[PDB]
Amino acid sequence: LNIAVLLGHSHDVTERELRNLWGPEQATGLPLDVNVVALLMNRTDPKSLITHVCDLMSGARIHGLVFGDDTDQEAVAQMLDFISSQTFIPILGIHGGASMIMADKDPTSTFFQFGASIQQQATVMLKIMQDYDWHVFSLVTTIFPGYRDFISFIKTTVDNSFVGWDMQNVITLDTSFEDAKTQVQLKKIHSSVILLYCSKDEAVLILSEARSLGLTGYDFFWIVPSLVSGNTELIPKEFPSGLISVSYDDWDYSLEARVRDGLGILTTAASSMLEKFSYIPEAKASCYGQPLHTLHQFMVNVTWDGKDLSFTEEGYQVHPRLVVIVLNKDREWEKVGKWENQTLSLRHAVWPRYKSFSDCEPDDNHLSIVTLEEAPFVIVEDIDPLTETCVRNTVPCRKFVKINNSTNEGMNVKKCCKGFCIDILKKLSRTVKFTYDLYLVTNGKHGKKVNNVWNGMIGEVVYQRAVMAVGSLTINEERSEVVDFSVPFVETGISVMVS
Amino acid sequence: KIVNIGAVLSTRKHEQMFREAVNQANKRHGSWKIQLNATSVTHKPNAIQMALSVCEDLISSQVYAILVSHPPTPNDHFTPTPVSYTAGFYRIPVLGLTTRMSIYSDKSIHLSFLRTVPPYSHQSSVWFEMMRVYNWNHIILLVSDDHEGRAAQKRLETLLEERESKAEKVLQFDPGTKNVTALLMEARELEARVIILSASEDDAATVYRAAAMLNMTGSGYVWLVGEREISGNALRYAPDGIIGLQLINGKNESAHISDAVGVVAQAVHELLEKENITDPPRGCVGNTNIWKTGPLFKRVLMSSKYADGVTGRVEFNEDGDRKFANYSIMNLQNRKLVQVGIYNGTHVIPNDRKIIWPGGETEKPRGYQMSTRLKIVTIHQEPFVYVKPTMSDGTCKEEFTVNGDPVKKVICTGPNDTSPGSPRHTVPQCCYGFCIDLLIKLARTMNFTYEVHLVADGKFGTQERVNNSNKKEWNGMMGELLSGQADMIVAPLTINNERAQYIEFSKPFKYQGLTILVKKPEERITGINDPRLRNPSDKFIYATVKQSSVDIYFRRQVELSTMYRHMEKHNYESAAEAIQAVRDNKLHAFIWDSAVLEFEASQKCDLVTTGELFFRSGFGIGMRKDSPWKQNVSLSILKSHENGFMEDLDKTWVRYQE
C-alpha cells in the first residue's frame, strides 16, 4: 500500500535509488495499489517529525512509515514510538538513533526496530565465554540504567547453562567513584574476564582507574557492549588494544538493502493480512480533530527471500546479524566475526593475544605447544553436542582441516583431547602455573628432513613456530642435534607384534 | 541574568499561587540581579498538538524546569511523556509531580526526568515493614500491569535478598480477562494467606468480586492493598476490614507546587555559584546541538538536599525518588475508612485506634496453616510399591499375609502405560507395600491425612535443557514436586550432591550399595574393576534405567566416560524391562541397588548378584525446602530406627524368603 520512507542523513545518500526501489521489487504484487513516497530530511528535531507525520498521514492515508537516523539520539525512536501509539501506524526504525535499543514497548504502539537487543547480545557474549572456557570471571555494574535487568539475565543464564559459571560477586557503584570504597571492591578482583555495563564517559574513568590499579594485564580480559562503544571515529587513547565488543553494525549490508528488506516485510504483512480480512487500509485522516485488525501481533511469522527476518514478542528480530569486533594495535575497531541463526561463527577461531596493551608491558609468559594424534597418548575426540563444552579432564584444541585439494583454504575445527600427555600437560600447568597455547599440527608425522627441510613437529619447533613438543616423539642423534630434549620419563622401546 | 520556568497548569488560582511562589522565591535570596520568569500553558483534549504547542513554546521560551501538575485528567493514560522526551533530546530535567508509573523510573528511557513521588514498589518495602512487624514470610503475589510487574518482581527480590526467603506464588497475565479464579483457588490450596495485589481499579474490583463469590475473604485471609485499589468501584467491592495505604498530601496540589518551587529555586541558586554556564539554543529552526551541561545539571540535582516544606525532608536517591515519606495506613471498618497506622521513613507506628480484622480477634491472624493432607507422589518400585488393579469398582481385596498381617492398602491414582502407548488412561488402583506402611507409621505417629498419587512416567528426574531460550528444567518426581502439584516424595530417593543444592533432605531409612544382576568360565564380573568393561564391545551388554541418578553419579565420574557412551544406546524405561530382557538372556549386566536384587534373587534363583559392595549410600524421603514438616518427621523416622519397626519391615519383605 501507501508507504512513506523518510530519511534523515548527513552523508550524501540520494533519493532516486529509492524511486528505483519500487519497480522491480514486489514482482508478485498482491495489493493492487502499492505506492512509495521517498523523502529526505536535513534537520533532526521532533517538530519536523510531527510536521512530516501530519503531512504524510493526511497525504492520501499513508499506512507505512520507514525512518533511518544518522545522529546519536535515542530519544527520536521514543518519539516515533509515541507517534506510532497515537496514530496507530506501523513504523520501522532502520539505522542510528532510529535503531537504538529501548527497553519496553506498549500494546498501543506498533513501532519496531531492525536491531539487536542487549539480552540477545548478552546471550552471544556468554556464548563466546562458553566457547573459550573462560568460566572464572567477574561483573562490574555502574549506576547506568537498565542494569538490574542485565544482572538478573546473567543470573538466570548462569542458572540455565551447562557450564556452572564461577562468577565473582557483583562490584556495584553508587556515584562517581571516590576511590575509597570502590577501591576495596576493585581490589577484590583477581579473575581474568571482566564484564562491564556503563556509558562511555563513565568507561573512560573506569579504564583510567583500571590502568591505575593495573587491571589491564595480559591475563585480564575486557568485554564491553555496543551501547558504550559509540562512534567509530571517536576513539580515545585510554582504550586497551584488544577490547572485545559486539555490535550489529554491519558495513557489508547498506541502508538501502535494509530498507528494501523492511519494505519486503511490510508488503509480506499486507499481503498475508489481505488474505484473511478485506478492509485492511484503515488509518487516521488528519492530526487536527477531537482499531481492531492491526499488524501488531500478525507479522511474527515472516520470511523475506529466505532471510530469517522474524519478529519477537518484544518487537525485535528473532535472528539478527551480530558482529564481534576487537580493537587492534592500530587503534581501530577491527571486524572479526559474524553470527549465524542461533549458532556462532568465528572467522578468527585462533584467539589472538594482543599481549602488549601499552608500550611498557614486558611479558613473555605464554607457551606455544603442539602435539600429534596418537591413541594411548592424545585421544582426540569431537566436542560434546549436548553441552558444546569439553568435559573437565578434556582440553580444547584446533585442527586446520582443508576443504579440498583445489584450494589451500581450510577451517580450524575445535575438538576435545584427553589421554596421557594431556594429563601430563595439565599437571605441568598445575605445578609451574603458566599459560599454554595448545594446538595440532597439520603438516604430518613426527619429522623427516627432505633437503634441509623438516616436517611436522620438528618443522614447527626447529623453525620456531612453536616453543616445545610435549607430545610423543622418538629420540635419535640428529633430533638431539637440532633441539635439546629433556630427561626421559617413560621407558618406551621398540617391539615386534606376532600371533 | 534571567531564568525561565515552564509549567503545564490549568487552574488560574494555582497559576496565581505558582507566580506568588516565584515572586517569594527571590525574597530571602538577597538583592542579586537574577530574574525569574514563569510560563504556564493550558491543555487541549488531544495529545499530539499539545506536545507540539508545549515543545515549541518551551523552545521559544528557553526554560530550565518543566512541570506537569494535572491529577484529575479524564484520560487514564497519564502520559506527560512527549514533553519529557523533547526535553531529553537536549537533556533538560522535567519534574513530574502527579503520576507514579514505573516506566518513568527507567532513566535509560527517560533520560532527563525527575520526580518527587516514588512508585508503588516502595510501598512493598512498607509491606516489608509489615514483615518486620507481623513476622510473616510466605507471600502470594498478583500483578496484572506487566509494565511495572518486572520492576515489582525486582523490588521484591531485592527485599527478599536480606532474609533469603522465597515468594510462594507469583502471577503475571494480561489485564482485561475475568477467569483468573483457578489461580486464586491454587493459591487458596497453599499454606500462606498473604495477598499482594498490584493492578488498576478494574482488575482490583474483578478480583474483589472473585474473592467475594468464592468466599476468599473469611478468617485468616490476609489482604493488603494500596491507594489505587481503594478507589472507584474497587472501594465499593472491598470487604470490610481490609488494610490499605494512603499518600499524605498525594493529591494536595497547593503545597506541592510551593515545594517544587523551593526545590527548583534552590537548585538554580546552587547552579549559579559554579562555572561553565550554557543555554538552550533555538532548537526549533536549525539547531540540533545538544545542551552540553545536561548531565552536569543532573549531577547538581543529584546532591540536592532540602530542609523546607510542609511534607518534610525531601531528598533524591540514585533513582531520583522521594526519601523519608510520611504514609498513612487505613482500615475499612463497616464501609468507613478508619486510620490505624502512621509511617515515617523507616518505622511503622499504629495509632490509638484498634486493628479490627475480617476474621476473628483483633490480633494478627497467623495465616500459615500447614497442609493437613500431604500430597504423596511415588514411582512404581517393584518390591516397595505394589500396585494392583481394583476388583469391581474402586475397591481393594483385603487379602491376608502368611504371618497374620492384614495388608492395609490405599486408593492411589495412576496412569496406565507410557505416553505413546497410553494417550490418556489414568485410573484409581490399590497401592501398598513398604513405603506405604512407612506412611502408615508416619500417620500413626503424627496425625495428618495424605493423598497418594503416582508420577506420570517411570523416571526419577534429570536436569535437562528445555527446547527454548536455553533454560534448565527438571522432570519426573522433581518436576512434579517443584511445580507445586506434589508435596512429599515418598520414594527411595538416591541422595546426591546436586539435588541437595536445590531441596532439603531428611534422614535415610535405607542403607545399601550397588550390585550387578547376572544370570546363572567367569560367570561373575566382580564390580567395575573388570578390564573388559573398561573397553567394552557388542558382547558384554550392560546398561541402566534411562534418566536415572546412577547415570548422574557416573557423569560426575570423569574417568568412566566410555561406560557413559556405551550405556546410552541401551537405556530402558523401567527396571522391570531390564529384568524381562535379562530373563530372556539378552542383557549381561545391570547396575542396581542391593536389597531389591537380593529380594528378586530370593524370588528367582537364577537371578545372581555380584560380590562387591560399592557406593554404600542411603535412601530417604524426598522433601521440600525449610518447612515445619522436617524436624518432627525426622524425629519420627529416627524413632522408627531405634525400635524394632525396621525389623518389622524386614519381617514383612526383607527377612521373608522362599
Number of residues that this document lists for chain A: 499
For residue B293, give the C-alpha cell. 551541561
Q: Which residues pair with A33 in a beta bridge?
A: none
Residue-wise burial string across B434-461, b where 16 or more C-beta atoms lie within 10 A, e elsewhere = bbbbbbebbeeeeebebbbbbbbbbbbb
Is residue B392 annotated as involved in ligand binding?
no
Closest to A38 (Cα-Cα) out of A74, A64, A73: A64
Q: How far apart are CA A128 and CA A138, in angstroms?
A: 15
Pairing outcome for strands A35-41 and A91-93? unpaired
Q: How far apart are CA B447 and CA A2, in angstroms?
A: 75
Residue-wise burial string across B77-89, b where 16 or more C-beta atoms lie within 10 A, e elsewhere = eebbbbbbbbbbb
Q: How far apart are CA B386 and CA B409, in angstroms?
A: 9
**DSSP label of A80:** H
Q: How far apart are CA B609 and CA B102, in angstroms?
A: 66
Q: How far is CA B375 from CA A174, A358, B634, in A?
A: 48, 65, 18
Q: How far apart are CA B306 and CA B304, in angstroms?
A: 7
Half-sphere exposure of B341 (CA within 13 A, CB side): 22
Q: How far apart are CA B626 and CA B163, in angstroms?
A: 13
Q: Give me the helix-helix angle, B81-89 and B48-61, nearest 10°.
A: 40
For residue B156, give the C-alpha cell. 521484591
Question: Are the C-beta atoms of A432 and A452 separated by less than 8 Å?
Answer: no
Q: What are phi and psi of B106, to 5 degrees?
A: -75, 110
Question: Are the C-beta atoms of A219 and A242 separated by less than 8 Å?
Answer: no
| Amino acid letter, residue A95 | H
Q: Which residues pair with A437 in a beta bridge?
A: A368
Question: Are the C-beta atoms of B329 and B353 separated by less than 8 Å?
Answer: no
CB-count burial class (<10 Å; 0-12, 13-18, 19+) for B186: middle
Q: How far apart are CA A51 and CA A54, in angstroms?
A: 5
**DSSP label of B651:** I
Closest to A391 (Cα-Cα) out of A204, A214, A133, A178: A133
Q: Locate the chain A residue with the closest alpha carbon to B87.
A: A75
Q: Which residues pair with A337 in a beta bridge?
A: A324
Which A residues, 83 through 122, put their C-beta within 8 Å of a C-beta on chain B? 83, 86, 102-104, 106
Question: Are the C-beta atoms of B102 and B130 separated by less than 8 Å?
Answer: no
Residue A231 C-alpha from the chain's centroid: 17
**DSSP label of A224:** E
Q: Which residues of B touch A78 (CB under 8 A)?
A: 81, 85, 109
Question: Are the C-beta atoms of B122 and B198 separated by less than 8 Å?
Answer: no
Q: How far is CA B58 from CA B38, B280, B281, B651, in A?
A: 11, 10, 11, 91
Number of residues that this document lists for chain B: 658
Residues just before a chain gap in chain A (C–N exceeding 2.5 Å) are: 290
Q: What are phi and psi of B509, to 5 degrees?
A: -90, -30
For residue B392, give the C-alpha cell. 469391581
Alpha-carbon dihedral sign for residues A183, A185, A189, A194: negative
A492 in contact with chain B, both atoms CB, cutoff 8 A? no
Closest to B41 (Cα-Cα) out of B72, B80, B85: B80
**DSSP label of B540:** S
Give alpha helix (H) positions in A147-276.
Answer: 148-159, 182-186, 200-212, 255-274
Q: Which residues of A touch B469 (CB under 8 A)?
A: 160
Q: Which residues of B touch A45 (CB under 8 A)?
A: 89, 283-284, 287-288
| Amino acid letter, residue B281 | P
DSSP-assigned letters across all residues of B33-71: S-EEEEEEE---S-SHHHHHHHHHHHHHHT-SEEEE---
Q: How far apart are CA A343 and CA B234, in angstroms?
A: 51
Q: Name the one residue in this structure whose C-alpha cell is 495477598.
A: B195
**DSSP label of A307:** B
Closest to B169 (Cα-Cα) out of B151, B148, B185: B185
Q: Locate the chain A residue with the closest alpha carbon to B154.
A: A148
Closest to B88 (Cα-Cα) out of A110, A82, A316: A82
Q: How far apart are CA A344 and CA A129, in angstroms?
A: 12
Task: Please tell me what resolution, in angstroms, this structure has.
Answer: 4.1
Q: How far apart are CA B262 and CA B311, in angstroms?
A: 12
Residue-wise burial string across A272-281, b where 16 or more C-beta atoms lie within 10 A, e elsewhere = eebeeeeebe
Rg (CA), chain B: 35
Nearest 10 degrees: CA dihedral of A108, A113, A118, A122?
120
A382 in contact with chain B, both atoms CB, cutoff 8 A? no
Q: How far apart are CA B532 and CA B528, in angstroms?
A: 10
Q: Choosing among B44, B59, B89, which should be mutated to test the A contact, i.e. which has the most A CBs within 10 A?
A: B89
Give one word for A433, left, alpha or beta, with left for phi > 0 and alpha for psi -120 to 50. Answer: left
Q: How far apart are CA A232 and CA A332, in angstroms?
A: 8
Half-sphere exposure of A42 (CA within 13 A, CB side): 4
Question: Are the C-beta atoms of A321 and A339 separated by less than 8 Å?
Answer: yes
Question: Are the C-beta atoms of B588 and B542 separated by less than 8 Å?
Answer: yes
Half-sphere exposure of A347 (CA within 13 A, CB side): 10
Question: Are the C-beta atoms of A400 and A411 separated by less than 8 Å?
Answer: yes
Q: Which residues of A touch B150 (CB under 8 A)?
A: 149
Residues near B39 by Cβ (< 8 Å), separated by ≥ 6? B4, B5, B6, B7, B57, B58, B61, B63
Question: Are the C-beta atoms of A402 and A443 separated by less than 8 Å?
Answer: no
Residues near B143 by Cβ (< 8 Å), separated by ≥ 6? B149, B152, B153, B170, B171, B172, B197, B198, B199
Q: How far apart are CA B266 and CA B259, in angstroms?
A: 11
Q: How far apart are CA B55 and CA B94, in angstroms?
A: 12
Closest to B22 (Cα-Cα) out of B65, B70, B84, B86: B65
**DSSP label of B446:** S
Q: Which residues of A touch B102 (CB under 8 A)?
A: none
What 3-state DSSP class applies to B86? helix
Q: Name the one residue in this structure whose C-alpha cell is 489461580.
A: B183
Chain A closest-CA separation from residue B518 CA (Å) = 32
Q: From which experimental method does this structure derive? A: cryo-EM
Question: Are the C-beta atoms of A465 and A454 separated by less than 8 Å?
Answer: no
| Amino acid letter, residue A324 | V
Question: Are the C-beta atoms of A103 and A83 separated by less than 8 Å?
Answer: no
